[PDB]
């Protein structure tokens, strides 16, 4: 008598409501004869999912009739799936800045695979960085200090991915990382072992404590070519383009005073500009002092050939396969994050469903902007949000991935049951 996920789909919002009404009448008439588990199994594994999808959560059949009649009697607009169930989702791993107080507490309790992944990482992060990652992600106050934030966010990122694959049967179609997000992207793509990637993130963030407070970063709603023309024109040498987020968005990095002055100036011209909370100006010459030490610390990291398509934001061709050695991690920290090019390559290759596996979404609008420039209908989802209750763990993200059209293994969530005589809607 536990709550179950009942999938419902059709060809339009009106047809989906007619389908909901038809199913509610059937469930109402046969509730004494049908097991909720069999009906959920039948709707997920015995039905071809149509473009306009939804799902009703219910613990009993009369609760499902109420949920279905709520859908049927409503006037909601149901967006159609953008993926065709042929490719898995593209996991997007953002950099730092997404952290929030006790971000890992609900998932440690509700998702056993999240807890088992944090358990694997716990001794590695303790040996490398000298702290408990479990205390960090469950503390009443947000994790602070670059040496604590980077391993804590990486741990949430990889534990989210492992949960999605092991518990929900969502194998990624591809991965895309943004700045330090590439550490989790490399584990998930099989370019690094979980332990080696933790060593990479721990060693890089310890060295970065030496350059804490060296600069600032800022977002601007201008294309990078335009931003660079403005910096050269103004004779600015202490600030550079650090991230190329989208065709219409750029992140600059450099000295604190000049970055703040550039944001204030863009605001005064009615150009949307924001300071990004970061003490270190990453992907700029501010990180130069640390790079020789980083290369030496990562000399014994053993890279592997990625098993999943990996779209690099470090390399000058995103389609190129990374050799995730110490040189790669030095270039990842110093080079401009070509995130827009990586997302563009994945979209050109046919990927339409993107899901950000991070404590809070930092790149969902960047993904949408790239899609819009390509005239593509894409979905940019968020794995979790700051202070969002997750009572049924990541089951909601599984629902949003299904609604969007991502390819997944329905046998992970609906392993067994009997196919029932539920209605089959003819044209649509």
Swiss-Prot record:
Region annotation Acyltransferase: where it falls in the sequence: 89-408
Subunit-structure text: Homodimer whose monomers probably have a head to tail arrangement.
Annotated compartments: Cell membrane
UniProt-annotated catalytic positions: 179 (for acyltransferase activity)
Gene behind the chain: mas
Top-level division of the source organism's lineage: Bacteria
Lineage, opening ranks: Bacteria, Bacillati, Actinomycetota, Actinomycetes, Mycobacteriales
Known role: Catalyzes the elongation of long-chain fatty acyl-CoA with 3 or 4 methylmalonyl-CoA (not malonyl-CoA) as the elongating agent to form tri- or tetramethylated-branched fatty acids known as mycocerosyl lipids.
Name of the molecule in the record: Mycocerosic acid synthase
């Amino acid at each position: 008598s536990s709550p179950r996920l009942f999938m419902l789909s059709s060809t339009s919002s009106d047809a989906l409501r007619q389908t909901a009404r038809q199913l509610a009448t059937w469930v109402e008439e046969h509730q004494d004869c049908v097991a909720a588990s069999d009906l959920a199994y039948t709707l997920a594994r015995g039905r071809a999912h149509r473009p306009v999808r939804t799902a009703v959560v219910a613990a009993n059949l009369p609760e499902l009739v109420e949920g279905l009649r709520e859908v049927a009697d409503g006037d909601a607009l149901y967006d159609a799936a953008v993926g065709h169930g042929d490719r898995g989702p593209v996991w997007v791993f953002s950099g730092q800045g997404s952290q929030w107080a006790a971000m890992g507490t609900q998932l440690l309790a509700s998702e056993p695979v999240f807890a088992a992944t944090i358990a694997k990482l716990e001794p590695v992060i303790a040996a490398e960085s000298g702290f408990s990652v479990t205390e960090a992600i469950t503390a009443q106050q947000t994790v602070t200090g670059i040496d604590k934030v980077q391993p804590a966010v990486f741990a949430v990122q990889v534990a989210l991915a492992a949960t999605m694959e092991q518990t929900y049967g969502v194998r990624p179609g591809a991965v895309v990382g943004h700045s330090v997000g590439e550490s989790a992207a490399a584990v998930v793509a099989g370019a690094l072992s979980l332990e080696d990637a933790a060593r990479v993130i721990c060693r890089r963030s310890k060295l970065m404590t030496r350059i804490a407070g060296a600069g600032a970063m800022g977002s601007v709603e201008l294309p990078a070519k335009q931003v660079n023309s403005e910096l050269m024109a103004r004779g600015i040498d202490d600030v550079v383009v650090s991230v190329v987020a989208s065709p219409q968005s750029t992140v600059i990095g450099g000295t604190s005073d000049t970055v703040r002055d550039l944001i204030a100036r863009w605001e005064q011209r009615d150009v949307m500009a924001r300071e990004v909370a970061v003490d270190v100006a990453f992907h700029s010459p501010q990180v130069d002092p640390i790079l020789d030490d980083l290369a030496a610390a990562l000399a014994d990291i053993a890279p592997m050939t990625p098993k999943v398509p990996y779209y690099s934001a470090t390399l000058f061709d995103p389609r190129e396969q990374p050799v995730c050695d110490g040189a790669y991690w030095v270039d990842n920290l110093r080079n401009t994050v070509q995130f827009a090019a990586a997302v563009q390559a994945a979209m050109e290759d046919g990927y339409r469903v993107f899901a950000e596996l991070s404590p809070h979404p930092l790149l969902t609008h960047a993904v949408e902007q790239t899609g819009r420039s390509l005239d593509m209908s894409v979905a940019a989802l968020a794995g979790m949000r700051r202070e969002q209750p997750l009572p049924h763990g990541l089951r909601g993200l599984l629902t949003e991935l299904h609604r969007a059209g991502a390819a997944l293994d329905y046998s992970a969530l609906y392993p067994a049951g009997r196919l029932v005589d539920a209605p089959l809607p003819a044209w649509g």
